[PDB]
Design an enzyme around this catalytic site. Structure first.
Site, PDB file in Angstrom:
ATOM      1  N   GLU A  35       0.840  -1.205   0.000  1.00  0.00           N
ATOM      2  CA  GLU A  35       0.000   0.000   0.000  1.00  0.00           C
ATOM      3  C   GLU A  35       0.874   1.253   0.000  1.00  0.00           C
ATOM      4  O   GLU A  35       0.645   2.172  -0.793  1.00  0.00           O
ATOM      5  CB  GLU A  35      -0.882  -0.028   1.261  1.00  0.00           C
ATOM      6  CG  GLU A  35      -2.024  -1.027   1.191  1.00  0.00           C
ATOM      7  CD  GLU A  35      -3.101  -0.786   0.147  1.00  0.00           C
ATOM      8  OE1 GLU A  35      -3.019   0.272  -0.564  1.00  0.00           O
ATOM      9  OE2 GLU A  35      -4.003  -1.609   0.001  1.00  0.00           O
ATOM     10  N   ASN A  46      -7.412   7.972  -5.857  1.00  0.00           N
ATOM     11  CA  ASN A  46      -8.239   6.897  -6.437  1.00  0.00           C
ATOM     12  C   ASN A  46      -8.999   7.477  -7.660  1.00  0.00           C
ATOM     13  O   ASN A  46      -9.344   8.709  -7.698  1.00  0.00           O
ATOM     14  CB  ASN A  46      -9.186   6.314  -5.396  1.00  0.00           C
ATOM     15  CG  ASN A  46      -8.482   5.809  -4.156  1.00  0.00           C
ATOM     16  OD1 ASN A  46      -8.907   6.162  -3.023  1.00  0.00           O
ATOM     17  ND2 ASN A  46      -7.422   5.051  -4.362  1.00  0.00           N
ATOM     18  N   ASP A  48     -12.134   7.278  -8.174  1.00  0.00           N
ATOM     19  CA  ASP A  48     -13.423   7.878  -7.750  1.00  0.00           C
ATOM     20  C   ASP A  48     -13.260   9.314  -7.246  1.00  0.00           C
ATOM     21  O   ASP A  48     -14.273   9.812  -6.816  1.00  0.00           O
ATOM     22  CB  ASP A  48     -14.162   6.925  -6.789  1.00  0.00           C
ATOM     23  CG  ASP A  48     -13.514   6.730  -5.440  1.00  0.00           C
ATOM     24  OD1 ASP A  48     -12.466   7.326  -5.249  1.00  0.00           O
ATOM     25  OD2 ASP A  48     -14.083   5.981  -4.604  1.00  0.00           O
ATOM     26  N   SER A  50     -11.515  10.049  -4.476  1.00  0.00           N
ATOM     27  CA  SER A  50     -11.048   9.881  -3.095  1.00  0.00           C
ATOM     28  C   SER A  50      -9.528   9.767  -3.146  1.00  0.00           C
ATOM     29  O   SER A  50      -8.971   9.548  -4.248  1.00  0.00           O
ATOM     30  CB  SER A  50     -11.719   8.745  -2.425  1.00  0.00           C
ATOM     31  OG  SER A  50     -11.313   7.522  -2.974  1.00  0.00           O
ATOM     32  N   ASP A  52      -6.197   7.951  -0.873  1.00  0.00           N
ATOM     33  CA  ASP A  52      -5.697   7.019   0.161  1.00  0.00           C
ATOM     34  C   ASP A  52      -4.501   7.632   0.895  1.00  0.00           C
ATOM     35  O   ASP A  52      -3.616   8.221   0.253  1.00  0.00           O
ATOM     36  CB  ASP A  52      -5.293   5.673  -0.439  1.00  0.00           C
ATOM     37  CG  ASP A  52      -6.395   4.807  -0.909  1.00  0.00           C
ATOM     38  OD1 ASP A  52      -7.528   5.105  -0.646  1.00  0.00           O
ATOM     39  OD2 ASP A  52      -6.024   3.716  -1.393  1.00  0.00           O
ATOM     40  N   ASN A  59      -8.768   5.355   3.066  1.00  0.00           N
ATOM     41  CA  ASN A  59      -9.494   6.038   2.015  1.00  0.00           C
ATOM     42  C   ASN A  59     -10.407   7.138   2.593  1.00  0.00           C
ATOM     43  O   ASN A  59     -11.124   6.927   3.535  1.00  0.00           O
ATOM     44  CB  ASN A  59     -10.267   4.968   1.223  1.00  0.00           C
ATOM     45  CG  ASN A  59     -10.763   5.565  -0.068  1.00  0.00           C
ATOM     46  OD1 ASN A  59     -11.922   5.986  -0.160  1.00  0.00           O
ATOM     47  ND2 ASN A  59      -9.861   5.708  -1.022  1.00  0.00           N
TER      48      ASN A  59
HETATM   49 CL    CL Z   1       3.239   5.679  -2.457  1.00  0.00          CL
END
Ligand code: CL
Ligand code: CL
Ligand code: CL
Ligand code: NA
Length: 129
Positions: A35, A46, A48, A50, A52, A59
């Site tokens: 991640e 993201n 959409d 959003s 992270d 999120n």
């Molecule tokens: Cl990253």
């Protein structure tokens, strides 16, 4: 902060992730590697709209407020920027809520695609924990 593999394993263990909702420590280390590359400052947009945030890429659609994600929630009651701190406390507390939500670690796409099914104990190998 860019954590080492074992340094992050220790912090996660200290904050009670080892076996949290039945997920061994290596699952969490694996998930953080793919991640964020163990970087607390990691941010990724993201599709959409959003974003992270942080070592576990939490999120803004559901979990934290960044002021720019329409129709989102803030279920961890935190500014997304709080998820970027060198101290992983806020990210851990929020991840405990996420993993308790019903789909377990499947909430983390990288965990589902890159950790799930694999020998995750390899991620804490050689660590003094
Ligand atoms: Cl990253
Ligand atoms: Cl927002
Ligand atoms: Cl993935
Ligand atoms: Na939000």
């Amino acid at each position: 902060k860019v954590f080492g593999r074992c340094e992050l394993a220790a912090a996660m263990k200290r904050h009670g992730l080892d076996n949290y909702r039945g997920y061994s420590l290596g699952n969490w280390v694996c998930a953080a590697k793919f991640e964020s590359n163990f970087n607390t400052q990691a941010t990724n947009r993201n599709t959409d709209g959003s974003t992270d945030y942080g070592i576990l890429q939490i999120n803004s659609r559901w979990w934290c407020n960044d002021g720019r994600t329409p129709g989102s929630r803030n279920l961890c009651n935190i500014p997304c920027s709080a998820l970027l701190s060198s101290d992983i406390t806020a990210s851990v507390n929020c991840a405990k809520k996420i993993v308790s939500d019903g789909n377990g670690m499947n909430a983390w796409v990288a965990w589902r695609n890159r950790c799930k099914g694999t020998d995750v104990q390899a991620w804490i190998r050689g660590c003094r924990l």
